[PDB]
Amino acid sequence: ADAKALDELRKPKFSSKYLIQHVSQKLIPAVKEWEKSYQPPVIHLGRVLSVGDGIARVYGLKSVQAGELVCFDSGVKGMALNLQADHVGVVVFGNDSVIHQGDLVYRTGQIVNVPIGPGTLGRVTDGLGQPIDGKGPLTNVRSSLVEVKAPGIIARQSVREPLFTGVKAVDALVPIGRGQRELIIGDRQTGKTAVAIDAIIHQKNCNEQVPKAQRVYCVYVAVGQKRSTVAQLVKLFTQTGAMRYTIMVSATASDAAPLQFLAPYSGCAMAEYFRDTGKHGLIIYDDLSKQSVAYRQMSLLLRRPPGREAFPGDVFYLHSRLLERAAKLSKELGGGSLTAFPVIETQAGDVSAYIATNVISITDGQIFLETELFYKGIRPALNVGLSVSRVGSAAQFPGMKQVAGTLKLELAQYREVAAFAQFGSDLDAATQYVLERGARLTEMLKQKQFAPIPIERQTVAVYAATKGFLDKVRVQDIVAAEEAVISQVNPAVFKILKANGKITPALDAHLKAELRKVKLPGA
Amino acid sequence: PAIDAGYVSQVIGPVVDVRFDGELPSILSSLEVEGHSVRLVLEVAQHMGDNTVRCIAMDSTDGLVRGQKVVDTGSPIKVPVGRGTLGRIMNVIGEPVDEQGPIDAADIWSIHREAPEFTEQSTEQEILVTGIKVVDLLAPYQRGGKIGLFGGAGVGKTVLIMELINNVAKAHGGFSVFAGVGERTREGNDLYREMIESGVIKLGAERGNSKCTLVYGQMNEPPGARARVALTGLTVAEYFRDIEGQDVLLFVDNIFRFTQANSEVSALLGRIPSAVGYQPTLATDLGGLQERITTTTKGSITSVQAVYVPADDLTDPAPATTFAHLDATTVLSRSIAELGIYPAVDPLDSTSRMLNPNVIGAEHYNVARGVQKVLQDYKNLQDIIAILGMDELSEEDKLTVARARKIQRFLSQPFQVAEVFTGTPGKYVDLADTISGFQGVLTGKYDDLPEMAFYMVGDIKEVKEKADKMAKDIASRKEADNKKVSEELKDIPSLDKLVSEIKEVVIEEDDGLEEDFKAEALSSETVVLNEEGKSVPLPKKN
Numbered sequence A: 001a002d003a004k005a006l007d008e009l010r011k012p013k014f015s016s017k018y019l020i021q022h023v024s025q026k027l028i029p030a031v032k033e034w035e036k037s038y039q040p041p042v043i044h045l046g047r048v049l050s051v052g053d054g055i056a057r058v059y060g061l062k063s064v065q066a067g068e069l070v071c072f073d074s075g076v077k078g079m080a081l082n083l084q085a086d087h088v089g090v091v092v093f094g095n096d097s098v099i100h101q102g103d104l105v106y107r108t109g110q111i112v113n114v115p116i117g118p119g120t121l122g123r124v125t126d127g128l129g130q131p132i133d134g135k136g137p138l139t140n141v142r143s144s145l146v147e148v149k150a151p152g153i154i155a156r157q158s159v160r161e162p163l164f165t166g167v168k169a170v171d172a173l174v175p176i177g178r179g180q181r182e183l184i185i186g187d188r189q190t191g192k193t194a195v196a197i198d199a200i201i202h203q204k205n206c207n208e209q210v211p212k213a214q215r216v217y218c219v220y221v222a223v224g225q226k227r228s229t230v231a232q233l234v235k236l237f238t239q240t241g242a243m244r245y246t247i248m249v250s251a252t253a254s255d256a257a258p259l260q261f262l263a264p265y266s267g268c269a270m271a272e273y274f275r276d277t278g279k280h281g282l283i284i285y286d287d288l289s290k291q292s293v294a295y296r297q298m299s300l301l302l303r304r305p306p307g308r309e310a311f312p313g314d315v316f317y318l319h320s321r322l323l324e325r326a327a328k329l330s331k332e333l334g335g336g337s338l339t340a341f342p343v344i345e346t347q348a349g350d351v352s353a354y355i356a357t358n359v360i361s362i363t364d365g366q367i368f369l370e371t372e373l374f375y376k377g378i379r380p381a382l383n384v385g386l387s388v389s390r391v392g393s394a395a396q397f398p399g400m401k402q403v404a405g406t407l408k409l410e411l412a413q414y415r416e417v418a419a420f421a422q423f424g425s426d427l428d429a430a431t432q433y434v435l436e437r438g439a440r441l442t443e444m445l446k447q448k449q450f451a452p453i454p455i456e457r458q459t460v461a462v463y464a465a466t467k468g469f470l471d472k473v474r475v476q477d478i479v480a481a482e483e484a485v486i487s488q489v490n491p492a493v494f495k496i497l498k499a500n501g502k503i504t505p506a507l508d509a510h511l512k513a514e515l516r517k518v519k520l521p522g523a
Numbered sequence B: 001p002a003i004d005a006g007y008v009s010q011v012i013g014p015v016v017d018v019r020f021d022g023e024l025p026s027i028l029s030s031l032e033v034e035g036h037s038v039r040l041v042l043e044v045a046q047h048m049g050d051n052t053v054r055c056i057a058m059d060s061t062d063g064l065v066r067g068q069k070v071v072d073t074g075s076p077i078k079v080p081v082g083r084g085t086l087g088r089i090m091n092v093i094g095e096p097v098d099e100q101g102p103i104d105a106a107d108i109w110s111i112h113r114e115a116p117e118f119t120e121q122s123t124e125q126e127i128l129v130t131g132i133k134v135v136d137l138l139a140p141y142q143r144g145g146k147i148g149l150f151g152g153a154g155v156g157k158t159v160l161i162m163e164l165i166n167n168v169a170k171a172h173g174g175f176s177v178f179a180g181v182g183e184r185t186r187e188g189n190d191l192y193r194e195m196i197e198s199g200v201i202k203l204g205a206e207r208g209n210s211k212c213t214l215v216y217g218q219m220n221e222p223p224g225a226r227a228r229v230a231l232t233g234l235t236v237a238e239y240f241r242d243i244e245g246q247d248v249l250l251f252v253d254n255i256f257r258f259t260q261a262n263s264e265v266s267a268l269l270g271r272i273p274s275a276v277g278y279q280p281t282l283a284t285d286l287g288g289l290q291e292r293i294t295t296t297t298k299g300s301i302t303s304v305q306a307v308y309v310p311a312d313d314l315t316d317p318a319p320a321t322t323f324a325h326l327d328a329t330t331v332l333s334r335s336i337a338e339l340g341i342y343p344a345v346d347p348l349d350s351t352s353r354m355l356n357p358n359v360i361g362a363e364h365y366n367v368a369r370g371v372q373k374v375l376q377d378y379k380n381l382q383d384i385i386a387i388l389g390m391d392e393l394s395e396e397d398k399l400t401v402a403r404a405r406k407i408q409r410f411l412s413q414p415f416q417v418a419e420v421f422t423g424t425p426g427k428y429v430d431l432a433d434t435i436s437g438f439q440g441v442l443t444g445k446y447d448d449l450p451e452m453a454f455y456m457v458g459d460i461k462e463v464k465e466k467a468d469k470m471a472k473d474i475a476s477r478k479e480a481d482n483k484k485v486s487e488e489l490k491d492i493p494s495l496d497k498l499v500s501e502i503k504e505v506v507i508e509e510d511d512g513l514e515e516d517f518k519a520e521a522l523s524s525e526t527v528v529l530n531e532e533g534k535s536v537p538l539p540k541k542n
């Protein structure tokens, strides 16, 4: 059954034609008898051969590009995933029940793209950019590709600008640079969403007082969540006015797994408008560990061979090519930035899992949220020993960098004199000092939800904690004492700390002065 | 025009089948795709059988149409080598990604070759002093050796490989090659900008006096570019080893990403997968790559490779296969790093071929084996220490636990590249100093000093000065009441005087987003292409 012995069968070798002109005059009446039974032949459009599991195999589509957004005649959109010799494998961005064998597939002529621009700000879109908030179509916008490559080495610079998150534990201990990527990893129900929400509300609070080029435009990608949670979140953002600066990409739990897979890429494409135009973006991929599960479903329904835990093996590349787009661009590219906050949910605190350790190898640091600290009321439940942000270090608030160093050392000593005391039977009265200073600082660090704190009022409070001015309150009233410190100290010193950036000698003079004339409620 | 120009038969992610009407290219030859938005280079992997080759793409395949002209180049991926590549950054296929103009190539070498033969193997063992206590004591590196840093996602092998760059790459007089295979682009930019301000990379007309060439295939690249950029780094280092004949340092950050990228493209090559999820050809792919990073009779490559381990699992087949190819494995632990001990080197899992008394001397060998015996006896005791406490130990066992906690803290060391995020300045420790210090802790000369005086200090002098510093404070805790600098007239303008020097900012409240924006008018219907390619609204049936 050779090939050169089959190309020799292209030339005619019959020399006897008693059947060519027998059927050549009888073929056209036969074709005209069975004419309404023919579907019209399809070459540059497509026709669905077989649809199932959210993957349509499409005959035709002779000139589709790889990774191109195709359209079914139902209206539901697809993506030309693998072009094959006879068919095209299409992943269906939506429910595959509206697709039937024989349906016309129309090629849109463009690789998978979403609308990006200023007019997507304020809006709740789905995973493909189509708006779901009901207030119309996206005006003042332009379409751009979701799978653009991240900027290279020469298109980057080091992070310098400090991107305050409004959380005292984070902005004191784990400071976040402006083009950084910081992982929010923790168990279920441990305040992972709340840190990102406090960052978004704080960016609303900071945008009203920065000169229009230091403004940070957030994007929230809600992958795999419930739709009621996204509805309550959009309600919260409109109640606080934050929606003027944020976009809400949402591919929820009922949505198809191509939509949950693609929603971080569409969200990052929307935020890369702000990165590529000299402005600053912040993006939160809420539960990237659900995007990995949707991609694992897509890979196992394409019968791709599974690897660790069941994952395809390019599940590292899935998250790496997404998070690498969160850069701090150079001066000749505009100076824009994009900060990423991927969220990963662990199971029973196991951070040595597959997707967890994949994203720890991508991001610049981690924010660990322990369930034991969360159940004891310490909220945000930051594992202070394990959480790291070294790229945001030497890129933070100088006034906070002055105070946070001794805060970090005192918390390190507190953790080790708590590990020293597995037991209450032997008191030392020299470690008891740091064991009470550490329980002072832990109570100082915890704050309540949806009220992010400006960076000067964090600096002044941690200044009042690591120094004296708080040793009279036991452990209980340190929240009330910190509120009395913020309310009773003259509000000019916050302005001096904000505009000078650091604590000058003329400033910590008035810090030691104004802190002694406040009245602490635990006496 | 027709023959030696095939056409794209099918595209499956990073895997492209090309159909040649005649004269198929050889396996490993590079093919250029015409009509793409960027330069797409396909390296031929297989001959599928019906005049079809199967290729791996060095860039993304988005936009590839199943008729596109693919031009054979008749040769593999060939990259510019020479001294003219020093101080440059190259990608996998050799294009300069530093915006410094073209690369002055002495030669253009194919990235695919064979390992040097058994006749060309150099077998000579000489120590490479790094200035790291745990490395120079328990797993000492070889001067032409292959060195693997095994790590578990956050345990510190990039900090360790950057400290090895800082400590070794300047004392070493030859050239240096950094190959970044599947790592952060932020780390590549940091390495470039700190090799410029160290003078290791000199920009402009002083480029020939650079000591390091960078090749980068970082983790935003497709799986075809990460599976071949280690070979571009090896080609740049192999030209210096063979033709230039001199000693090279090859730092490969994450040689695991080579294996992982081959297992990404390997499922689409139509292979039955092996263990955990890997390619069947893992060991021979890694062997064919790693057998070329050797020293020969003509030159020398000291090879430091970071090796990621997938889920803190050293029995995963990519670390477990990499372990055979290394003269010195430095295994970094997660539980060591959670004790704060940095570098997080597991002292009972990091081996070397140089821990041999006929190589490093009997005193060094004996102090290394004594340290390892003390730490192993502590590890044997920890299960009954955790339950029963230390009160149930024998007294020689309490001596074992005390000396083992002391040498556990003493293997910790501050780094000169961790001084930017810890505040502690980093200490280079000479080999005789760490030998004498660990010998002194083993004999018992420092049983009076506490545990935390050994933590993050350079020498055995600095544990004594840290006990002097810790002891003196043990009284110094308070009595800083007044006579301060925090007065109200001696340095001090008033608070309302201090507000009056605050400068005003201009607030516009316009958000500045519609300045240079061309807004596409989206349609009310899905615009699609019909059979003729015209942009038609979506027809109304289903």
Ligand SMILES: Nc1ncnc2c1ncn2[C@@H]1O[C@H](COP(=O)(O)OP(=O)(O)OP(=O)(O)O)[C@@H](O)[C@H]1O
Pocket (backbone or CB within 6 Å): A187, A188, A189, A190, A191, A192, A193, A194, A195, A345, A379, A380, A447, A448, A449
């Ligand atoms: N700083 C805080 N202070 C007090 N309560 C908090 C704080 N942060 C979060 N919580 C509470 O913890 C609960 C869980 O918060 P959140 O939804 O942020 O966690 P999560 O990690 O998103 O959990 P899940 O991922 O399962 O939704 C919320 O009901 C919230 O009220």
Ligand SMILES: Nc1ncnc2c1ncn2[C@@H]1O[C@H](COP(=O)(O)OP(=O)(O)O)[C@@H](O)[C@H]1O
Pocket (backbone or CB within 6 Å): A360, A361, A388, A390, B151, B152, B153, B154, B155, B156, B157, B158, B159, B160, B342, B343, B344, B415, B418, B422
């Ligand atoms: N020698 C060290 N000293 C102090 N901290 C370290 C050291 N090595 C690693 N770390 C901490 O571990 C983190 C991860 O380091 P890195 O080398 O990037 O890890 P990996 O490359 O294994 O993911 C760093 O951000 C740092 O906080």
Ligand SMILES: [Mg+2]
Pocket (backbone or CB within 6 Å): A192, A193, A286
């Ligand atoms: Mg959540």
Ligand SMILES: [Mg+2]
Pocket (backbone or CB within 6 Å): B157, B158, B183
């Ligand atoms: Mg690394």
